[PDB]
Write a protein that binds this ligand. Structure first.
Ligand code: UMP
Ligand code: UMP
Ligand code: 14C
Ligand code: 14C
Lengths: 303, 303
């Protein structure tokens, strides 16, 4: 099945991984350097064996494609993926006043913050704006001359003109910023590849939470490859997912067994037949057919 | 054998690669996304089946470790690897006067240039200095504030303090410079990894000439892993070589058969037992034992 490689990497790490401490202080089982391929011509690799809300994948990806770094857009779409980190520029702040039942009055203050990012421009501008996150790296990289490079936009022209180039690289890794930056980007870099009609994409992912993060990350960049083939009028080849540290968090050990005895089912993807400027896609330009997942598995997001 | 993965990737590309045009206009057989592992504890992976001059690998690597970008240091060591690209800032120049038997009077003007880089400081400074090449990317990355980051140096402290970090990334890919730069770096990025006593390193290599380039590149970064384990007092785990476009150039098709019926032999590496500041290694701090290669195979360096 299309998603076997994901199931194989959970198996491998579980049966061969070596206990590893982590920044988080959860602890992990980990392997270094692993690859999976997904032949995108065979269907779209959204995990069946456990539910991965595609609404969520595409809003965030469209948030990336626009060069947006403000939670607000994600909020206009019920996407709460990135709420945490915007909340902390406010959870710490000097414009801040306010406070187990943390489990419930954390929600009360989260529902507050969401609300006024959603409606108060000045608050949004100060707390909603996540800053140095994939939208800026991708389409507004801060040149040393105080300018800004549209990196993805630039590489798509190059796919169109010089499809055969081995330089079709977009990076998210900025050595000037990674020392003191909230999340040095997990998706360090990717590279496209055109051979005879088919565009492929490889992601180098420095660090991978296999239970929680990877199901999504596969879809974000599988989705990204389609969208880029679409705009270049190419067919789709493969998505290659390459990993540094691929790890299972130790509290996810239960869940991943749970998931591993599921029996995989694979959806198809449908792109607007008459739009091509992907920087200009909204949610109805991307449609997933025949997604039939098993339900969500409850997992403690390890720190 | 230790070098089988290299032999397997030449086989794979030869038996499964798909004709691909290239910047060069030689043409190639290519695959996208491939990985090889070399367990450095089992011996050093310098190809036996064809000769790879280790003198050359280590001078260039020490040239990198010093943050040097001038051909001169390579010249003081009979390393001619990078002569070409320094010659062109002079092969084109406005301080330039001078001129088949290009095959022999190319050599006459190369032997001139080498000589006076070797001895004339001002010429060296103008023509020998390659500029934006792995030494600057690694230990002097040009911050946006006109400063300079010692990136490798910085990540080695982090290995020492935070060995378990999945952020141990050094990159050579600078989006501000890759549009108009002689060689966008083929060795785009690498990442270290420490699990229980053993340091590992993964290289993401965007583009790989499998006959000419890869034998060297394996050794440069296998060598790099040792040197870094050594300085951190770690043992050595694996070198993982990850590729974008791994290609055979079409004029190398003969040679790589020639090489493929050779029968692999694997050297050992010996590091100074009493030095650790690798930024301060000279050539006698690195010694290779029991290297026993088959001889060099003559190959047209495809553009
Ligand atoms: O898209 C993402 C973003 C984050 N992570 C995970 C990987 C790590 O477990 C954790 C924090 O990363 P480190 O900086 O500690 O590597 O978040 C993912 O798996 N996928
Ligand atoms: O260390 C190196 C440096 C260069 N190349 C090769 C790969 C390509 O065949 C050629 C030029 O690279 P491109 O920019 O066209 O990808 O040089 C290597 O294999 N290894
Ligand atoms: C809500 C939820 C629930 C389960 C798992 C995940 C998320 C989420 O936002 N992400 C995520 C995606 C992209 N970037 C980040 Cl920081 C996180 C997950 O991996
Ligand atoms: C002399 C010779 C002969 C055969 C093969 C190679 C070289 C060389 O300098 N390199 C090389 C290494 C690192 N960077 C570059 Cl641009 C080239 C080769 O791959």
């Amino acid at each position: 099945m299309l998603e076997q490689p994901y199931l194989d990497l959970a198996k491998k790490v579980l049966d061969e991984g070596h206990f590893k401490p982590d920044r988080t202080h959860t602890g992990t089982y980990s392997i270094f350097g692993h690859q999976m391929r997904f032949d995108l011509s065979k269907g779209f690799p959204l995990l069946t064996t456990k539910k991965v809300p595609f609404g969520l994948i595409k809003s965030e990806l469209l948030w990336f494609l626009h060069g947006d770094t403000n939670i607000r857009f994600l909020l206009q779409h019920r996407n709460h993926i990135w709420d945490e980190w915007a909340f902390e520029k406010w959870v710490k702040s000097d414009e801040y006043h306010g406070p187990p039942e943390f489990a419930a009055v954390y929600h009360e203050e989260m529902a507050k913050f969401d609300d006024r990012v959603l409606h108060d421009d000045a608050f949004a501008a100060k707390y909603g704006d996540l800053g140095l996150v994939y939208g800026s790296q991708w389409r507004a990289w801060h040149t040393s001359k105080g300018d800004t490079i549209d990196q993805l936009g630039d590489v798509i022209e190059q796919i169109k003109t010089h499809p055969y180039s081995r330089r079709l690289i977009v990076s998210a890794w900025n050595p000037e910023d990674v020392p003191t930056m909230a999340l040095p980007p997990c998706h360090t870099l990717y590279q496209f590849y055109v051979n005879d009609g088919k565009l492929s994409l490889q992601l180098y992912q420095r660090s991978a939470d296999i239970f929680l993060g990877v199901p999504f990350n596969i879809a974000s960049y599988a989705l990204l490859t389609h969208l880029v083939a679409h705009e270049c009028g190419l067919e789709v080849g493969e998505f290659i997912h390459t990993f540094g540290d691929a790890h299972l968090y130790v509290n996810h050990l239960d869940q991943i067994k749970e998931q591993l005895s599921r029996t995989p089912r694979a959806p198809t993807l449908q792109l607007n037949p008459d739009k091509h400027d992907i920087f200009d896609f909204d949610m109805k330009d991307i449609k997933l057919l025949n997604y039939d997942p098993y339900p969500a598995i409850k997992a403690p997001v390890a720190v």
